Design a protein around this ligand. Structure first.
Ligand SMILES: *[C@@H]1O[C@H](CO)[C@@H](O)[C@H](O)[C@H]1NC(C)=O
Lengths: 37, 49
């Protein structure tokens, strides 16, 4: 049922700023009230 | 491929090897030993495992 999508009007690229969403919790540890790096 | 023979090779006999790779100091463990548990007595200087 797969088929190439027709009317694929090419569009210019879009950009944005990452701001302040780029991290996670590196480990399974409850370090609290700490400034760990 | 190598010529696996019953006894003609004499040496170079097949070796079934299995390698285990544990991972420690992580999320709560799924595999542990056969040791059993006890109570959780509090407010006392006790050893814990
Ligand atoms: C749609 O086009 C792609 C790219 O040429 C091709 O690989 C695919 O088989 C086509 N699908 C059909 C249903 O013709």
């Amino acid at each position: 049922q797969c088929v190439n999508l027709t009317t694929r009007t090419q569009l210019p690229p879009a950009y944005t700023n990452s701001f302040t969403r780029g991290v996670y919790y590196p480990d399974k540890v409850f370090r609290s009230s700490v400034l760990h790096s | 491929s190598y010529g696996f023979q019953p006894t003609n090779g004499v040496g170079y006999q097949p070796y079934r090897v299995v390698v285990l790779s544990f991972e420690l100091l992580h999320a709560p463990a799924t595999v542990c030993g056969p040791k059993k548990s006890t109570n959780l007595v509090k407010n006392k200087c006790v050893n814990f495992n």
